[PDB]
């Protein structure tokens, strides 16, 4: 079992937090995800470290409390976002995407 946080994280689109206290891994690839997907899940010392991970892989982290409390209430890992996260969720995919140039 060991690596298979680091290789979600490494793997992940963005990464949005409230301060080391929760930290929510959102993964979405096209023709992969239907919709964003939460990954991995994160609360004190579990976020800091997706948080450190995050630096290591480059993987954006963008701190906005109140989305990243309602993601780690509603959204479970494995479970895809529902339909109140949407447009919140894509305004951090949209920001967080390699465009690879």
Same mark, same amino acid.
């Given at each position: 079992?060991?690596?298979?946080?680091?290789?979600?994280?490494?793997?992940?689109?963005?990464?949005?937090?409230?301060?080391?206290?929760?930290?929510?891994?959102?993964?979405? =690839? #096209?023709? %992969?995800?239907?919709?964003?997907? @939460? *990954? &991995?899940?994160?609360?004190? /010392?579990?976020? $800091?470290?997706?948080? =450190? #991970?995050? %630096?290591?892989?480059?993987?954006? @982290? *963008? &701190?906005?409390?109140?989305? /990243?409390?309602? $993601?780690?209430?509603?959204?479970?890992?494995?479970?895809?976002?529902?339909?109140?996260?949407?447009?919140?969720?894509?305004?951090?995919?949209?920001?967080?995407?390699?465009?690879?140039?």
């Amino acid at each position: 079992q060991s690596g298979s946080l680091a290789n979600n994280i490494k793997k992940s689109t963005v990464i949005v937090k409230n301060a080391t206290h929760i930290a929510i891994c959102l993964y979405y =690839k #096209l023709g %992969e995800t239907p919709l964003p997907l @939460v *990954i &991995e899940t994160g609360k004190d /010392a579990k976020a $800091l470290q997706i948080i =450190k #991970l995050a %630096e290591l892989y480059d993987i954006p @982290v *963008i &701190e906005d409390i109140p989305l /990243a409390r309602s $993601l780690y209430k509603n959204i479970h890992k494995g479970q895809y976002i529902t339909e109140d996260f949407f447009e919140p969720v894509a305004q951090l995919i949209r920001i967080a995407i390699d465009l690879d140039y």
